[PDB]
Design a protein around this ligand. Structure first.
Ligand SMILES: Nc1ncnc2c1ncn2[C@@H]1O[C@H](COP(=O)(O)OP(=O)(O)OP(=O)(O)O)[C@@H](O)[C@H]1O
Ligand SMILES: Nc1ncnc2c1ncn2[C@@H]1O[C@H](COP(=O)(O)OP(=O)(O)OP(=O)(O)O)[C@@H](O)[C@H]1O
Ligand SMILES: Nc1ncnc2c1ncn2[C@@H]1O[C@H](COP(=O)(O)OP(=O)(O)O)[C@@H](O)[C@H]1O
Ligand SMILES: [Mg+2]
Ligand SMILES: [Mg+2]
Ligand SMILES: [Mg+2]
Lengths: 435, 520, 113, 383, 52
């Protein structure tokens, strides 16, 4: 019945089953490993051998070590029993509050719902950020992406979104930390104990947030499936409990990156820039599950790391088509000191139809993008000559657009710990009138 | 014809002759009396070459287990294939032959950690190379340790003073963070890191035992001439009694340069795990990935971008995430990493630079054009970030850095208009000289770190406009005039109060008036 | 160990098998005994489809292949060399290599006379 | 090992029989005693030799044609793409997680078909033709191949009738004829879909004003998109009325990469029904740069030799044999037409990239849509 | 692109000084006098510090 390890190359294990191989995506438990080592079957190699990716490290694996099939994929605890807990990729508690209550034990592998259960209802999500709510308003129920290179402020912007949207929200939230720093996962945890979002001990059911962490130290098997584990916790609230869930995924680039770290060892010849041939299909199969169906709603916020500020890289460029509102954060805006460093002429929302947000919001958004594109067209001269050759026709459109660039800047509640200025939450009616 | 099915042999292995020899030579009637080589805990070398031995047998060897060849040279069982083991070699493969015996040691790779490593120069595996004998007061810990999780950590609050004025002010560093020093060649990357180590000696004599920082310098892929210059420097200063030197130089095997950051971190993790504070400097983490690429291309793992392996991110994230500030349940210790990545013509879009930029919190970006404008340390203030930020800055320095970070932001945009001194404006010209007082304030000679209280007084002397009278070319002498002519009790109460108190910013207001500044 | 050196050196992994099979049979003075038995298997792979199924079919398990070849060759006065040889080729699934092992066994016997 | 020494082994050389006459009397008991440890040998069937990443290498299948639909015993369909000497490499139209090593593959004897006809009009099918709008199977329809050879030189006439997009920038400056291939190229979020949508909506406004043979029947192929994006397009075409004349072939992003590769060919076979019957078709392949990534994925997993940007050598032949099916037929073939609008997404305007260069060579002109003109107020941002 | 006549006086002082030290770092070599004719010059270290 059982299988034995035949080959260990890094984070990729070949297991040999003398009769009755496991299915692909099935979870295998290695018997005799010190830590609980879980392998997930990636492919059938051909001679009664499966090839697996390990959810933990493989140092200490012996060829011949017994491997037990579980007959199912990776199964995680779902339900109210996980709120206020920190879960692993394999559903294990790493918060040291004891074992996790299980409303159900769901597989992390699923099909996307269908075309027939799609909710075609565009309604605004008032964020509280001036540059977001004006030029790229977010959809209540849709997929939001915060694109940016390293150190432009996607983690801060997703921290401002957590306490401006998920704080006053009727349903629950899941934060799937997918392959970022472990320090800022401990920062996010202690921020939510003191803000009361996660309540410890006997008030645990009154928590409104589930954390799933798959951070940078973990092997590429763990970082590739921890977004699927964090999605399963949100797919239980959407399907079985039928409610509006929030899913904050920090660095969905790390999902595609962790697949790329194993895929050459999975026997795949490389694609373009270093990525696997299955780049759009791995990324596509995950993101089609984060949808608002007719049962519930999942409003997702996904930070996307953009490698070396290059939006033409295929891992940020493939995930543009999976989103309703893209918040491209720019290094150029941050060198001016303007925060949040949202590029106004690169952020796009599907909500900017005047059929949806109305023509009074639509014209102050299109007018701000018009006056800021004109200023970009005039910096070819007024950064060479010095604002004297314009005859006060479009001298005035510079000083209108220069006030607009600073007015898009906004202090954050979470940037009080960085900068000495209080946080500002702006209403949508106020930011239309001010702009 | 049915015989053409068996025309070409379909081989499911490569070392088939080594299996059929294990069954045909005991069929000889003289040779059943234990004339057999063993396979369970021993191995035979099949192939040697380029520091990769492929070993037949070793059926019970673990992944990443240290093995020993019968020649004495050790190795690490890295590929566990279905019919052999790919063993990288921790020395020269000239002494390994085909048919040599490979003994497994039962041990995943270990190094001596402990307080007996302080003061010593070891190689990438823990053997000391300074010629002072074996390591005495140590124990052998593992090299690949899992990084401490979310619950094991706490926030980075206490600072780690470097002594470099451009980083204690602009890019402040806390105990427990990871600050990348990225730059081109010969731009001040080692010098910034060496000044951080030398400064800890100047601060370990003034703090209690629980506040001391124990440095670890990991030198990967450098010369032995450079490392012996550092040990000569760290002994002349006195920093060797707090410093470990892990040195896998360029003549060492590529598995030794691959493991020396991890072996150096495991030594530095002793101080983190026992409540003390560590500071590890991985000099040329770019040269570790070159050694890891070589070791992986010879193991026939398929290459990716710039022929690097797929797991060269996980090479560096599992190293760098071990620099953590632990919680109070776990002793409260910290480890601060300073990885050094060398770029080529300032191209930080390269593969290893983009990996470590996204791993680390901050980055100290040094430029080769600022280096030759006399700005030394050549810190690019626009591109340099610290993601802990002013949460772990010295207060008082934090009070004056906001005036310094803002004025240098305006001084940079007023530049690319500064080529027209005929075109006076007296508002841009106000900040074109004020930021230039600040720019030549942040210059600093190397191997002389400054105490943090002497730095924040020198930034106070230029943000409040005391040095507005002096010319731009004589501020480095004026900063000596500020320091050497004030009362040295202004520094004694600024270090103890920890911030510029209201009973001090009017004391030292008039104290910078009774000094003579070289400009009139 | 101490095996008699082959009459001529040959190529890789199928001539290596036959050179080792030659060196073992020359240590046992059965150089015509196992040569004829190799010819006996070639016609025997020609007779039956159930025996060349154990050399081409990739779905025949290793346990079926090693049990059948051993249980068939338990007797018949075949050499201990060729009995252990066919267990070795059926362990690894290299039973199809026999047809070109034996032509390297031929030219070793031809260069022995 | 050589051949001249190995061809002389077909002749018997044994000259002694203490083994051949023994074990022939002892083979059939040993083989039969592990009969339940055997699988029956496949010749015209197939057995799954290995499977992974949507690619099943299949032992057997002696009589499959290249490009033929095979069916696994899970009910999942396949497509025999490279027939090799030992196995068949099939691509899997769906999940390979229900495909195991040792599964039985059955050939269907059919090169890949789609339902074309008057009954597919107004329905939303997947990339293989099966309806996903949830209103039953397609009725009043017939099957046809997706790899139709394009019409020749002599079955075409000159493109003279104008096809109106309804966009002033298009209909004045870059005017489209009735059997023309026009690329809509540009970066992301520059209004490439919105040009193609307005060309479809304008056909509905024109179809009620023309005498029944000038009517244009649109096909929107959505390749690699979201399922919510296609749900918006169905809502936009239904609330307008444009899905009386519109088909929507939808291979979304979670669909298998052979289905996203095959969806432009499946939509063109539905669109060629109108061209071949004297009516006029209009087809929009939205994200033809997402078909080519899907075809690159199947090629690199089938171990085909990569070219530049790791695309296969026949990725020009992929798009040219699709886009040359958009023709204006001669009056002896009915005079019908099919006009294509492939949509290529560039990366920062780089139209020297490999797939954008290939489709620029194939089509009869581009519609560029710059993103600097887009934020300058010029919408549609036609450069 | 703009020319010499558009810099500051502080800039075109250093443009003339750096054009002077660019030529002054050049030197006739004694091994190159076979194909250039100009005799070589062994410049002392004190001569190049005080010269520069
Ligand atoms: N603040 C400084 N002031 C003056 N000289 C400095 C300063 N910092 C570095 N240098 C000098 O500049 C040169 C740069 O060498 P450094 O030690 O900075 O190495 P690096 O450039 O980081 O590394 P590599 O040798 O690999 O290029 C050395 O001669 C060093 O002494
Ligand atoms: N002519 C127009 N006038 C006003 N707004 C427009 C026009 N065309 C497009 N837009 C707006 O611009 C946005 C991008 O348009 P569209 O979706 O057609 O571009 P796209 O090229 O398909 O982008 P992607 O390929 O990333 O989906 C849409 O949200 C749409 O509302
Ligand atoms: N809203 C903001 N206000 C002030 N500073 C900010 C803001 N957002 C980002 N920053 C600065 O930029 C850095 C980027 O932080 P982080 O969001 O973690 O980067 P990334 O987006 O690359 O994860 C922060 O450390 C902070 O110093
Ligand atoms: Mg981040
Ligand atoms: Mg250096
Ligand atoms: Mg589009």
């Amino acid at each position: 019945d059982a299988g034995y390890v035949s080959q260990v190359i890094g984070p990729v294990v070949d297991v040999r089953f003398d009769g009755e191989l496991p299915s692909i995506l099935s979870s295998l438990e290695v018997e005799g490993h010190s830590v609980r080592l879980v392998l997930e079957v990636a492919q059938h190699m051909g001679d009664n051998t499966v090839r697996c990716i390990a959810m933990d490290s493989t140092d200490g694996l012996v060829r011949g070590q017994k491997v037990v099939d579980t007959g199912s994929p990776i199964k995680v605890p779902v339900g109210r029993g996980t709120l206020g807990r920190i879960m692993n990729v394999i559903g294990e508690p790493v918060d040291e509050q004891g074992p996790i209550d299980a409303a159900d034990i769901w597989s992390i592998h699923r099909e996307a719902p269908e075309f027939t259960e799609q909710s075609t209802e565009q309604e605004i999500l008032v964020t509280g950020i001036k540059v977001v709510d004006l030029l790229a308003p977010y959809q209540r129920g849709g997929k939001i992406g915060l694109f940016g290179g390293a150190g432009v402020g996607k983690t801060v912007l997703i921290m401002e979104l957590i306490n401006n949207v998920a704080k006053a929200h009727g349903g629950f939230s899941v934060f799937a930390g997918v392959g970022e720093r472990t320090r800022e996962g401990n920062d996010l945890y202690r921020e939510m104990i003191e803000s009361g979002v996660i309540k410890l001990g006997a008030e645990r059911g009154n928590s409104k947030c589930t954390l799933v962490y798959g951070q940078m130290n973990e092997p590429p098997g763990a970082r590739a499936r921890v977004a699927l584990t964090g999605l399963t916790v949100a797919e239980y609230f959407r399907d079985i409990e039928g409610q509006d869930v929030l899913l904050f995924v920090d660095n969905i680039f790390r999902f595609t990156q962790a697949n790329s770290e194993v895929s050459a060892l999975l026997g795949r010849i490389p694609s373009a820039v270093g990525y696997q041939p299955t780049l759009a299909t791995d990324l596509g199969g995950l993101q089609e599950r984060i949808t608002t169906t007719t049962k519930g709603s999942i409003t997702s916020v996904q930070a996307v790391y953009v490698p070396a500020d290059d939006l033409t890289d295929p891992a940020p460029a493939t995930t543009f088509a999976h989103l309703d509102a893209t918040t491209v954060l720019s290094r150029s805006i941050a060198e001016l000191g303007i925060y949040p460093a949202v590029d106004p002429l690169d952020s796009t929302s599907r909500m900017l139809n005047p059929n949806v947000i109305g023509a009074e919001h639509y014209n102050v958004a299109r007018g701000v993008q018009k006056v800021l594109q004109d200023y970009k067209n005039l910096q070819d001269i007024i950064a060479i000559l010095g604002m004297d050759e314009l005859s006060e026709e479009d001298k005035l459109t510079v000083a209108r657009a220069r006030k607009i660039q600073r007015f898009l800047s906004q202090p954050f509640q979470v940037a009080e710990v960085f900068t000495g200025t209080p946080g500002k939450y702006v209403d949508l009616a106020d930011t239309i009138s001010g702009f | 014809k049915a015989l053409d099915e068996l025309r070409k042999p379909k081989f499911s292995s490569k070392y088939l002759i080594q299996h059929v020899s294990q069954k045909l030579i005991p069929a000889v009637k003289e040779w059943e009396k234990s004339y057999q080589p063993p396979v369970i805990h021993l191995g035979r070398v099949l192939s040697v070459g380029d520091g990769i031995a492929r070993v037949y047998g070793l059926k019970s060897v673990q992944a990443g287990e240290l093995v020993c060849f019968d020649s004495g040279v050790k190795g690490m069982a890295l590929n566990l294939q279905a019919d052999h083991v790919g063993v990288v070699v921790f020395g020269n493969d000239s002494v390994i032959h085909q048919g040599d015996l490979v003994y497994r040691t039962g041990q995943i790779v270990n190094v001596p950690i402990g307080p007996g490593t302080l003061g010593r120069v070891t190689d990438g595996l823990g053997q000391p190379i300074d010629g002072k004998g074996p390591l005495t007061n140590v124990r052998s810990s593992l090299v690949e340790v899992k990084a401490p999780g979310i619950i094991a950590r706490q926030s980075v609050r206490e600072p780690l003073f470097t002594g470099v004025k451009a980083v204690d002010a602009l890019v402040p560093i806390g105990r427990g963070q990871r600050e990348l020093i990225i730059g081109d060649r010969q731009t001040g990357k080692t010098a910034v890191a060496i000044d951080a180590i030398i400064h800890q000696k100047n601060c370990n004599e003034q703090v209690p035992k629980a506040q001391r920082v124990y440095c670890v310098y990991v030198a990967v892929g450098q010369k032995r001439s450079t490392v012996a210059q550092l040990v000569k420097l760290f002994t002349q200063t006195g920093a060797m009694r707090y410093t470990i030197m892990v040195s896998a130089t360029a003549s060492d095997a590529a598995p030794l340069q691959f493991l020396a950051p991890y072996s150096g971190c495991a030594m530095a993790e002793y101080f983190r795990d026992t409540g003390k504070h560590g500071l590890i400097i991985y000099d040329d983490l770019s040269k570790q990935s070159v050694a890891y690429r070589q070791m992986s291309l010879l193991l026939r793992r398929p290459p990716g971008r710039e022929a690097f392996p797929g797991d060269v991110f996980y090479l560096h994230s599992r190293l760098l995430e071990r620099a953590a500030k632990l919680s109070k349940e776990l002793g409260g210790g910290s480890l601060t990493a300073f990885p050094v990545i060398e770029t080529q013509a300032g191209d930080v879009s390269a593969y290893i630079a983009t990996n470590v930029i996204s791993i680390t919190d901050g980055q100290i970006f040094l430029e080769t054009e600022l280096f030759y404008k006399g700005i030394r340390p050549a810190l690019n203030v626009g591109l340099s970030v610290s993601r802990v930020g002013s949460a772990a800055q010295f207060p008082g320095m934090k009070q004056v850095a906001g005036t310094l970070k803002l004025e240098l932001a305006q001084y940079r945009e007023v530049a690319a208009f500064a080529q027209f001194g005929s075109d006076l404006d007296a508002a841009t010209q106000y900040v074109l000289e004020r930021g230039a007082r600040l720019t030549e304030m942040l210059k600093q000679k190397q191997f002389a770190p400054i105490p943090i209280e002497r730095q924040t007084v020198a930034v106070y002397a230029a943000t409040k406009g005391f040095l507005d009278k002096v010319r731009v070319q004589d501020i480095v002498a004026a900063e000596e005039a500020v320091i050497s002519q004030v009362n040295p009790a202004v520094f004694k109460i600024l270090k103890a109060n920890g911030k510029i108190t209201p009973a001090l910013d009017a004391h030292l207001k008039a104290e910078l008036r009774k000094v003579k500044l070289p400009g009139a | 160990l101490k095996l008699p050196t082959a009459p001529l050196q040959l190529s890789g992994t199928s001539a290596q098998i036959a050179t080792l099979l030659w060196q073992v049979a020359a240590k046992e003075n059965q150089l015509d005994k196992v040569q004829d038995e190799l010819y006996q298997f070639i016609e025997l792979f020609k007779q039956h489809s159930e025996l060349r199924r154990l050399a081409t079919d990739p779905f025949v398990p290793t346990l079926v292949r090693t049990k059948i070849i051993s249980s068939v060759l338990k007797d018949s006065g075949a050499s201990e060399i060729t009995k252990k040889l066919f267990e070795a080729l059926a362990d690894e699934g290299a039973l199809s290599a026999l047809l070109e092992v034996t032509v390297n066994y031929e030219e070793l016997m031809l260069a022995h006379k | 090992a050589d051949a001249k020494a190995l061809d002389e082994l077909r002749k018997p050389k044994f000259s002694s029989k203490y083994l051949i006459q023994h074990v022939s009397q002892k083979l059939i008991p040993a083989v039969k005693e592990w009969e339940k440890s055997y699988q029956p040998p496949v010749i015209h069937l197939g057995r799954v030799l290995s499977v992974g990443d949507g690619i099943a290498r299949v032992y057997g299948l002696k009589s499959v044609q290249a490009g033929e639909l095979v069916c696994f015993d899970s009910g999942v369909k396949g497509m025999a793409l490279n027939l090799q000497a030992d196995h068949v490499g099939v691509v899997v139209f769906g999940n390979d997680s229900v495909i195991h090593q040792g599964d039985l593959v059955y050939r269907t004897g059919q090169i890949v078909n789609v339902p074309i006809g008057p009954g597919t009009l107004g329905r939303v099918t997947d990339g293989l033709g099966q309806p996903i709008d949830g209103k039953g199977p397609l009725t009043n329809v017939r099957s046809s191949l997706v790899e139709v050879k394009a019409p020749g030189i002599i079955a075409r006439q000159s493109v003279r009738e104008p096809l109106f997009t309804g966009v002033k920038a298009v209909d004045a400056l870059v005017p489209i004829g009735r059997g023309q291939r026009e690329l809509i190229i540009g970066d992301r979020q520059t209004g490439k879909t919105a040009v193609a949508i307005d060309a479809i909506i304008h056909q509905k406004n024109c179809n009620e004003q023309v005498p029944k043979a000038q009517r244009v029947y649109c096909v929107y192929v959505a390749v690699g998109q979201k399922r919510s994006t296609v749900a918006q397009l169905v809502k936009l075409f239904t609330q307008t009325g444009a899905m009386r004349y519109t088909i929507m072939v939808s291979a979304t992003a979670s669909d298998a990469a052979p289905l996203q590769f095959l969806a432009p060919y499946s939509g063109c076979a539905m669109a060629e029904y109108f061209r071949d019957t004297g009516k006029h078709g209009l087809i929009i392949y939205d994200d033809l740069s997402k078909q080519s990534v899907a075809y690159r994925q199947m090629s690199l997993l089938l171990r085909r030799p990569p070219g530049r940007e790791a695309f296969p050598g026949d990725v020009f032949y992929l798009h040219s044999r699709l886009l040359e099916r958009a023709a204006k037929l001669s009056k002896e073939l009915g005079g019908g037409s099919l006009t294509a609008f492939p949509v290529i997404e560039t990366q920062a305007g780089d139209v020297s990239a490999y797939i954008a260069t290939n489709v620029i060579s194939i089509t009869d002109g581009q519609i560029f849509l710059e993103t600097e003109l887009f934020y300058k107020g010029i919408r549609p941002a036609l450069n």
